[PDB]
């Protein structure tokens, strides 16, 4: 289930994101700062979508391959990347599918990545279906086989243990996707015994114009992830180092304290495979 | 959407519901009791299903006629009917298809009955799909004008305000439902932004034997109620009477007070037309 | 695939026949003639249906026991018998679901009936999704193991030697359904490779009224047969027999001969099972 | 319906024509001879593909511009521009997504093209669902629209003359597709009432190896055509140039005389508008 199959996500998420430079204008200086600390020069996207943090950080210097299963996402990177392929740096930047489920195969690490990321709640979509997180922490396995020792994994999501406990995702501005013509976002919770299971977005972006004056249109769309609680998230990604690893996690780019006043959108797992 | 189409509800529904005798034991007394204390003879089952309660009624002396929107289930009380069609009583045994949404023209009240019956958490099968509550209006209207000056309408449905608040809905033993052969009933909750909007239940009931000694075979089946809070269908309920009623209501058919210790599985509304 | 099983086809069954009384008064001397020839009191009806042909055989004094994969045509039927349960020759009318795959453990046979018949073009309804013409060999083996020595088989099926050469169903009076009601058929044959794979009918039967004065009202359902050119069936049921039958073959009830004048719309096959 | 969105058959379109060298050998000297004849240097294609006659017209020094609905297959082609991108002729071509039925608005013809190509069988592809040839005319006139006057237009097809009458479409050899991977083709033709309505074939290639030493694998995938009879699609598309055209048709890129020994696989229909 590519759950962009349809397109309809892809062709609009342009329009989704708002102003990329806006939204990559935060943690641009943080990303790069933590990504030029440790000395990281080969960077894997597994999250390419349409190719906003990849080339942020192909127009950075940085040697970057992005991988996504939806076609209709990256066909959009693919497109900029032709426009913009007398730029020498992109003239070297890969582009091409793969399925975090067999990542290990779509994805020859060979001897790996410097950091490998995964950014704007794009893991979450991993469904739980076999039952058991099995798809999750193989999936989470993979992405991680991808890390050179040394090297450093910058996965996300958003913050469910507050979607889950006000039955509403955040509205308005949001680090990842600020865009005015977002017009609405309707959260749907399954919890399937007494477990949350599956919390689904609809979104209707208003598609610029879509009709002269007095009518204006918009685009629908929606897609499903599995609410990933911080504490359970942590848990999962650090096994999936077998714990030769550093930990840590931000709110949204910034310290994140339990209890703190500032509740993030978003939860950023930082860490540094060692050996 | 008749939910009971596929048919492998009703083909396991006599091991869903177990001991009918056992089941109808319970109640029985005071169905019958507060049929009998209300001079009603002329009874209408618009939940027949399976003939449960209609074949109880008819045995009991009354003059039942019961209709149900899936021909599925109506197909066993037939069956029911046929094979018992040397017994007076059961030749004047009327059972047709019916829709409470069409009630008034499917069943032609006329004069009316003397009392109406919708047990085993029938009710809440009908969806809100329109929005608003519409629908349930409607068939709770229809199915209300069936009920003659004086008359009752004894409708039930299960305790919705415990299933949304622990997410399960309670196991085992059932006034309704009591069958060793039912294995598992697994609840979702699915709440639409932040209201309840539908409790899905999947049932694995155990076909006897489905295998030699060492292999045991099930049947599983869904079925979707909307959850009916207590207060909101007591309010519901009462207005498709315009108030001309006296409502009250019944744990497990025993008397209920709220906040008492023992919690209902199923919530009996009676209510009594005056006029 | 019950192929019945939306239930619009049997809804409007008796519209589609038209005047079964009209219908029955065509071959009903021969049937019967037949039937009595040969000394048939025992009668099994695999085609069922809503009863039409059923229903005669219980009026004229044969022990009738009817069969059909439909609940939703056979329902018709058992509403039929209910409604003249008080006719003594009704109330030993036997109705019940099956399948001609699996007749043998469907109705047990025991002795085996004196006749056995399947009209109106039931079987054809039939595919060869095997590829291979087993599923025709294992149904026309168990209808014909329901045949007791010495007893009859009567099975027919649309002329599709013709339909398949004009590429159209005949239009108009029809001896199983002749209703000014069926405003429409419309013909669809399918050839895999060179071969004819299946002829789909598409009826319109006109609801009586369906609107007020100015508005009428239609039904519509679509229906697909296997198209069985009759020097095959009568090669495939004669086989079904494993030879030890007299066979022959009638145009429309009448004598057949082959380059007669007359096109006959239906094929009757009379077997009669011998040592 | 895109009828590729599946995807399957872009995947091993590769393995369906086999060596494209080898089949772009035929024609390659008549197309190429037709195109200079009449100075033709700006070249639109409308059945792009997977790019087979786009990439040979580039090559050849042609300034080409590719369109095509399924951006399954143009995915094909847009990786082939990309990794010969270093190519100067490579770096001017032009792939986009367009769809006969709107080109008008998909392609900016303005001045319009030297000439215009749809070849592979691709228009065929167009249903006939409205009932009435219009998408057939619309379409047939969008991609005449888009020629220049003087400009020339390439539109072939099966000879389905051929595969209406032995209902089997021609096996083997064929100079669009020449591949012995290509296991097996099972026509299928669709006759609504007495008039052909579809072609499906169904194609089973052999994927290149998919197993070890003693298990071969393949890739079943189907698509469905208009049965356009040579008679008929020569009136159509001249209609679609209304009339200001010269037409002629060639077998299979050889001249073709009804009645001629030689039974061609595709009809080749070149129109030169005059208007
Ligand atoms: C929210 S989008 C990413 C948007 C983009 N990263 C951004 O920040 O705007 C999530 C992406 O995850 C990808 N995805 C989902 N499941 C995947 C899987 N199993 N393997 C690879 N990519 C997957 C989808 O194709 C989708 O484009
Ligand atoms: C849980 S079953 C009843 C079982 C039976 N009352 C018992 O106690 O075993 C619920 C019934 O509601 C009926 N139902 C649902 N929607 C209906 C409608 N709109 N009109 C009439 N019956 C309806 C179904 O056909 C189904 O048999
Ligand atoms: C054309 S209808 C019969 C109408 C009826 N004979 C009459 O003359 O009005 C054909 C019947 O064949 C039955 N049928 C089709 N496939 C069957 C199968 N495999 N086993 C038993 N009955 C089957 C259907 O349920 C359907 O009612
Ligand atoms: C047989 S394939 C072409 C193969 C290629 N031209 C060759 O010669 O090998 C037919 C193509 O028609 C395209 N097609 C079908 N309907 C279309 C439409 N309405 N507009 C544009 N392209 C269409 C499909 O996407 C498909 O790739």
């Known amino acids: 289930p590519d ?27 943080w990303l790069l700062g933590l990504l030029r600390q440790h000395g990281c020069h080969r960077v894997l996207d597994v999250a390419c979508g349409t190719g906003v943090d990849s080339i942020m950080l192909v127009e950075e210097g940085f040697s970057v391959t992005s991988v996504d299963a939806s076609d209709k996402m ?20 890969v582009i091409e599918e793969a399925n975090w489920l067999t990542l290990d195969k779509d994805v020859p690490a060979g001897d790996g990545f410097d950091a490998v990321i995964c950014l704007g709640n794009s893991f979450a979509h991993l469904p739980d279906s076999k039952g058991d997180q099995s798809e999750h922490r193989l999936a989470l396995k993979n992405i991680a086989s991808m890390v050179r020792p040394g090297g450093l994994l910058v996965i996300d999501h958003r913050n469910y243990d507050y979607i889950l406990s006000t039955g509403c995702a955040p509205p308005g501005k949001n680090i990842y996707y600020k865009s005015d013509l977002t017009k609405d976002i309707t959260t749907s919770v399954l919890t399937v015994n007494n477990k949350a299971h599956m919390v689904t977005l609809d979104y209707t972006v208003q598609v610029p114009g879509a009709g002269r004056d007095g009518a204006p249109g918009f685009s629908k769309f929606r897609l499903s992830y599995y609410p990933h609680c911080l504490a359970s998230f942590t848990e999962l990604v650090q096994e999936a180092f077998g714990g030769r690893c550093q930990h840590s996690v931000l709110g949204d780019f910034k310290p994140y304290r339990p209890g703190q006043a500032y509740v993030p959108c978003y939860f950023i797992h930082v860490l540094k495979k060692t050996g």
């Open 74 to 93: 990256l066909k959009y990177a693919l497109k900029e990347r032709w426009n913009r392929r007398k730029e020498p740096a992109f003239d070297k930047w």
């Open 3 to 29: 759950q962009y199959a349809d397109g309809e996500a892809a062709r609009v998420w342009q329009l989704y994101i708002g102003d990329t430079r806006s939204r990559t204008a935060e943690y641009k200086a």
